[PDB]
Amino acid sequence: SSQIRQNYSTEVEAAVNRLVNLYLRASYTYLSLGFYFDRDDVALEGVCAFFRELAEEKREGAERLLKMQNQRGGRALFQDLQKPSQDEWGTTPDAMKAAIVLEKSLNQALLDLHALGSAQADPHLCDFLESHFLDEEVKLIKKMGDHLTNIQRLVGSQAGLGEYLFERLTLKH
Amino acid sequence: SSQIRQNYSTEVEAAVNRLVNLYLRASYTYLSLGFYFDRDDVALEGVCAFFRELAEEKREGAERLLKMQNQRGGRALFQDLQKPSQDEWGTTPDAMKAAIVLEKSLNQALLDLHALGSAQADPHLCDFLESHFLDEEVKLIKKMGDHLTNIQRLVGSQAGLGEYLFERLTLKH
Amino acid sequence: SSQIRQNYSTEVEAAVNRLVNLYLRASYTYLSLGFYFDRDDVALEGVCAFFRELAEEKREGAERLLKMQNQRGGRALFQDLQKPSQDEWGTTPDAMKAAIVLEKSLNQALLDLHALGSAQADPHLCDFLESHFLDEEVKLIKKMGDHLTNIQRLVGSQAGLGEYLFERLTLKH
Amino acid sequence: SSQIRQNYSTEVEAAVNRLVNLYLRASYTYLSLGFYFDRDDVALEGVCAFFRELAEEKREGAERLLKMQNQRGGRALFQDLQKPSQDEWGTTPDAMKAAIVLEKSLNQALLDLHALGSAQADPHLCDFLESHFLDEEVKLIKKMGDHLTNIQRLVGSQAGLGEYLFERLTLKH
Numbered sequence: 001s002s003q004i005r006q007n008y009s010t011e012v013e014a015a016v017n018r019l020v021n022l023y024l025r026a027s028y029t030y031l032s033l034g035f036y037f038d039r040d041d042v043a044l045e046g047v048c049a050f051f052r053e054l055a056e057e058k059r060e061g062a063e064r065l066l067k068m069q070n071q072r073g074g075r076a077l078f079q080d081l082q083k084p085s086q087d088e089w090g091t092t093p094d095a096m097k098a099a100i101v102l103e104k105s106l107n108q109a110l111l112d113l114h115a116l117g118s119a120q121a122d123p124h125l126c127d128f129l130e131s132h133f134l135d136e137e138v139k140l141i142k143k144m145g146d147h148l149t150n151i152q153r154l155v156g157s158q159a160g161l162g163e164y165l166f167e168r169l170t171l172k173h
Numbered sequence: 174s175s176q177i178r179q180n181y182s183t184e185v186e187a188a189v190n191r192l193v194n195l196y197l198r199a200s201y202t203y204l205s206l207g208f209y210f211d212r213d214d215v216a217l218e219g220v221c222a223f224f225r226e227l228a229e230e231k232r233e234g235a236e237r238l239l240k241m242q243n244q245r246g247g248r249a250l251f252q253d254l255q256k257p258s259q260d261e262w263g264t265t266p267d268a269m270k271a272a273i274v275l276e277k278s279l280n281q282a283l284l285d286l287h288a289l290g291s292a293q294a295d296p297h298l299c300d301f302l303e304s305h306f307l308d309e310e311v312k313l314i315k316k317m318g319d320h321l322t323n324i325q326r327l328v329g330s331q332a333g334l335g336e337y338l339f340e341r342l343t344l345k346h
Numbered sequence: 347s348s349q350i351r352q353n354y355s356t357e358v359e360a361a362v363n364r365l366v367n368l369y370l371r372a373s374y375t376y377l378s379l380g381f382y383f384d385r386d387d388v389a390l391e392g393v394c395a396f397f398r399e400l401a402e403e404k405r406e407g408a409e410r411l412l413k414m415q416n417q418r419g420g421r422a423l424f425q426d427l428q429k430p431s432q433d434e435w436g437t438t439p440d441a442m443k444a445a446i447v448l449e450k451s452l453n454q455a456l457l458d459l460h461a462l463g464s465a466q467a468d469p470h471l472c473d474f475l476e477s478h479f480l481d482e483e484v485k486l487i488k489k490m491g492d493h494l495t496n497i498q499r500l501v502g503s504q505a506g507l508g509e510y511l512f513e514r515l516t517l518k519h
Numbered sequence: 520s521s522q523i524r525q526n527y528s529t530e531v532e533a534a535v536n537r538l539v540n541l542y543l544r545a546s547y548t549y550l551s552l553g554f555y556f557d558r559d560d561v562a563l564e565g566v567c568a569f570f571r572e573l574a575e576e577k578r579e580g581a582e583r584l585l586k587m588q589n590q591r592g593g594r595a596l597f598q599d600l601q602k603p604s605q606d607e608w609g610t611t612p613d614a615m616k617a618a619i620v621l622e623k624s625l626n627q628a629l630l631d632l633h634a635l636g637s638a639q640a641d642p643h644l645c646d647f648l649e650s651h652f653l654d655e656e657v658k659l660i661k662k663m664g665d666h667l668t669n670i671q672r673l674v675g676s677q678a679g680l681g682e683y684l685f686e687r688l689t690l691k692h
């Protein structure tokens with residue numbers, strides 16, 4: 001039961017639960033991406049760290065959604081988390097491309113939920129999504145696009161050398 | 174080309190470019206206002222500093238817009254910047270009135286863009302505009318209105334004395 | 347009016363106003379160069395920062411000229427600012443070449459004004475120009491020439507790799 | 520005798536001695552202006568301090584000239600110092616006007632000496648004059664013009680009140 005729920009539709013409640021699943025799926029995907037780059041036959045630690053950081057960011061996003069669900073008086077419902085789409089992630093550009101596709105899918109899910117919020121006249125939801133999610137997605141996708149452009153520029157010259165240089169000079173910290 | 178653009182209409186992209194032009198025009202206008210008050214035959218340094226600060230604020234606004242344009246995958250297009258509407262700006266109340274007219278025009282441009290964002294279901298744009306621009310405009314216009322009221326109150330008593338006192342006791346820092 | 351003007355010709359006054367326009371035009375050009383390198387499909391942040399810094403330097407130069415105009419009792423007159431000569435700036439060497447052409451044009455304008463100062467026996471003007479402008483131009487043009495030589499050396503080997511390495515190892519800070 | 524003199528004309532040597540006399544005369548004038556404003560029937564201490572500071576600046580200028588005379592191997596020759604042109608200096612605008620006339624006369628003397636330096640191909644002299652004298656004069660005359668404009672603006676409203684306010688709010692430190 002709840003004694004606090006106000007202006008919070010069942011449609012939004014369900015969409016928030018689905019979004020939590022998407023964010024946790026994304027986190028899982030990034031966990032797989034990170035460890036792939038830590039394989040001794042891949043060995044690009046800056047790339048491992050980049051994706052591991054994203055895994056943490058996506059988990060944090062799911063937790064923020066869940067906190068908000070409870071703040072509004074909605075009820076968390078969890079579903080199975082599907083395994084990531086690949087077991088091996090190819091080259092650095094392959095991985096960065098996959099990451100952009102993933103982020104665009106999350107961004108579209110956020111946009112869809114914001115639209116539902118608007119249709120349901122739920123300004124708390126719509127603002128929650130922008131502050132913690134929509135601006136972060138735009139910034140993140142720009143960073144990934146910039147990364148992809150740099151790695152593409154590098155591997156068009158020399159693939160092995162380019163991947164090493166990108167990891168050493170852009171990613172490693 | 175872009176590999177990041179998502180939910181960013183050509184209409185909004187063009188409107189953002191036009192807004193950059195308006196902000197740069199405003200910056201240019203404030204540069205002219207500031208130096209007019211630094212003329213040896215005007216010599217009101219607090220007024221010079223007030224308008225110079227605004228010139229910097231408007232330039233910063235244009236830069237923020239341009240950064241956002243690139244974040245969204247839009248493409249900056251610059252146009253000629255028209256010279257300010259006057260070469261000489263009259264009395265302090267004349268100048269403050271001109272400044273209010275200018276800010277109201279920027280504010281209306283922001284409102285128009287927010288409306289376009291709403292019509293295009295672009296919540297990232299609409300929120301970007303409020304956070305960095307719409308609240309700043311409201312605060313700035315209130316300050317200018319307060320200034321205009323004070324200078325009008327002063328120059329209704331004694332024009333020369335009133336302009337000096339306003340610059341010394343309200344503006345100078 | 348002015349009560350301070352002394353040994354300040356109308357010819358120099360007009361030339362200073364034209365120089366302000368040239369410096370503001372240059373600033374605008376550098377703003378465009380900087381944001382071009384921040385495009386997600388270009389993504390060379392060290393180059394973005396290099397040109398943005400120059401945009402600020404040129405704006406500062408215009409402001410110094412304007413302050414001097416008022417110090418001498420001349421009157422600032424502003425004209426339209428033409429848009430930069432290109433919308434897209436090509437490769438890093440293309441951009442650095444454009445920048446050198448631009449600086450050489452400013453340098454020539456400064457030399458022309460110094461010559462006018464000499465012809466008008468205006469030592470305050472001639473010294474003002476050397477201290478704040480002429481030595482800065484020489485230093486800046488040497489830096490740009492050095493940059494161009496380095497990027498040319500790099501892209502003659504491998505274009506993509508060379509542009510990345512230059513941005514990472516010379517420009518980025 | 521001298522064992523160091525090189526490229527230092529007798530014409531420049533004599534002109535430097537005359538300039539020392541002019542600077543000392545100016546210092547004396549400012550001493551008189553300062554004490555006039557300290558009269559119990561005038562009693563404008565910010566004005567006293569303003570002119571006393573100028574008296575010190577002009578004395579310092581004479582000393583710099585004398586040091587340079589000896590550096591070049593010229594020989595200091597002192598003449599009688601004429602008393603200031605007035606015993607009483609009238610109102611604050613009267614005094615500021617007198618001060619501007621005085622500074623313009625020094626500035627013209629500096630310009631005349633720079634021209635002589637140029638005619639004698641004496642670059643050390645010409646540069647000495649710009650660095651320590653010509654830029655200082657331009658700055659000082661702009662400040663005085665700004666002051667005169669402010670006091671005129673004030674006394675056009677109310678003479679007694681305006682003079683008090685200027686001394687309290689612009690000059691006093």
Ligand SMILES: [Pd+2]
Nearest residue numbers: 118123126127
């Ligand atoms: Pd909303």
Ligand SMILES: [Pd+2]
Nearest residue numbers: 291296299300
């Ligand atoms: Pd909105």
Ligand SMILES: [Pd+2]
Nearest residue numbers: 464469472473
């Ligand atoms: Pd010269």
Ligand SMILES: [Pd+2]
Nearest residue numbers: 637642645646
């Ligand atoms: Pd010279």
